[PDB]
Structure formats: C-alpha cells, structure tokens
C-alpha cells in the first residue's frame, strides 16, 4: 500500500510517535518519505547480505529476522515480513525500540540526509 502523507501522519500520531523521545511527528513522516516514499512493501537488498524492510526501511541485521542475514540479532523479535504489513503497527513498535538506542533518529540515513535540521513540521501541514 502507498499511504497518503496526511493518512500516514494520522496513523503515526495514533500509534504515539508524535514527540516520542523528543521527535515531533514531522520527523517520522519525513523519514518515511525518503526511506520508502510511504510504501508499506518497500524492500532494499544490501551488499552485506541484509535487507531493509517496510515503510521505515528497518534492517535485518539487528532488528528483524528474515532468515537469510548474517549476524542477525532480531532485537525487535519479529519476522521481517511483519514490517511489510499494510497497517504500520509493527513498524512503529520496532522504530520505538530503535530510536531509544542512543543516537536517536540518526539510525535512519534518510532522516539524517533529508530531514534533520529542516522545517519538518511541513510534513504534517494541510492535514
């Protein structure tokens, strides 16, 4: 499924991401825009054998289990297929674990490159 921007913002708000660990809602919508363009089925195979999954492109080396990634820790204790669900519940639950890891949202390359330091609230306006 491809979420609409406001549709995703509302879902993320319902799941408690607005200002979670100090990150306002727009940071999360912006991260999704540049990791997956709001597509729940997005997948990216990496050269190290891992794969990034779902709307927030969560990686299989440390966070979910896809049974084919070396050095797997499955810290979200979920199969990576759960991160490809049409509703965002699993992805939000796992993202909350990741962002509390220490370096916050810097865990997301897309957030660092396209969202950090910008007017992220723009992503939830007109909603």
């Amino acid at each position: 499924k491809v979420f609409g921007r406001c549709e995703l913002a509302a879902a993320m708000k319902r799941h408690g991401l607005d200002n979670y660990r100090g990150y306002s809602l727009g940071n999360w919508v912006c991260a999704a825009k540049f990791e997956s363009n709001f597509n729940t089925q997005a997948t990216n195979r990496n050269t190290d054998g891992s794969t990034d999954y779902g709307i927030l492109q969560i990686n299989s080396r440390w966070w979910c289990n896809d049974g084919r990634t070396p050095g797997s820790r499955n810290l979200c204790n979920i199969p990576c297929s759960a991160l490809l669900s049409s509703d965002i519940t699993a992805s939000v639950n796992c993202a909350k674990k990741i962002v509390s890891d220490g370096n916050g949202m810097n865990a997301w390359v897309a957030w660092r490159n396209r969202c950090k330091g910008t007017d992220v609230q723009a992503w939830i306006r007109g909603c």
Binding site: V2, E35, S36, A42, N44, R114
Partner: protein
C-alpha cells in the same frame, strides 16, 4: 520479492531488451545495482499483458525513482525515470524507449506506478 528492474537488466533473455530501453540515457548506477523496490504488478493494455515494476534511490526515495513495464512474450521494455528537485520541487521525467504503442496509456501506467495509484488500484489500469 525477486522479479525486479535490476533482475531484468541482468537476465540473459531480457538484458538486450533492457539495454535497448536505456540506450542514450544516463540512469544512476543504483538502478542496475537494485534500489528500494516493491513487487511487480500485472496490467493489461488492449489484449496484451505487462509486468509493471518500480524502484527508488535508497534512502532518498521520494527524490529519484524509476518505473518499467515489461511484456515477456513481446520482448519489449519501456520505462520512466523521475527526479524531483530539492529546491524547486519540479519533477523532471525522462521517457525510456517508449514505443508508439505505449505512447499514451503506457505513459499513464508508468506514471501511476510512481504516484502510488497503481499499487492502490491494481485492477484500475487495464485499458481497452
């Protein structure tokens, strides 16, 4: 997860068709390496079937993306590359070997693959 624009580019029976599609263009290397993708979808134009797929630039998905439509039995591959400027918001499209047969409805389908309408309305682009 498996049939992708990346795999078509490498396939022994489809690589020549892919090369014909991109001849004269300067697509980013990420396209052939394999970007962030979703499963191929089937669409019918007239009485002919196409596999439609897309992919975006890793970690900059909303900025650069590509859609390709492929007819296995027709040995034809046409595509659309899109880059959105991070200062003007203008969207620059490059059409890849769009043959006349796909010059109208095929262009519509490829763009729908990028907007999200095709993924959300899988059976909404089977034109007569």
């Amino acid at each position: 997860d498996d049939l992708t624009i990346s795999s078509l580019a490498k396939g022994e029976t489809t690589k020549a068709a892919f090369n014909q599609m991109v001849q004269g263009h300067k697509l980013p290397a990420w396209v052939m390496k394999g970007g962030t993708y979703t499963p191929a979808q089937t669409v019918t134009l007239g009485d002919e079937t196409y596999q439609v797929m897309s992919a975006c630039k890793p970690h900059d998905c909303g900025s650069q993306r590509i859609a390709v439509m492929w007819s296995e039995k027709s040995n034809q591959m046409t595509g659309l590359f899109s880059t959105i400027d991070e200062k003007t918001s203008q969207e620059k499209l490059t059409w890849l070997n769009v043959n006349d047969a796909l010059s109208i409805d095929g262009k519509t389908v490829l763009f729908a693959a990028l907007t999200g309408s095709l993924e959300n309305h899988p059976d909404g682009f089977n034109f007569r």
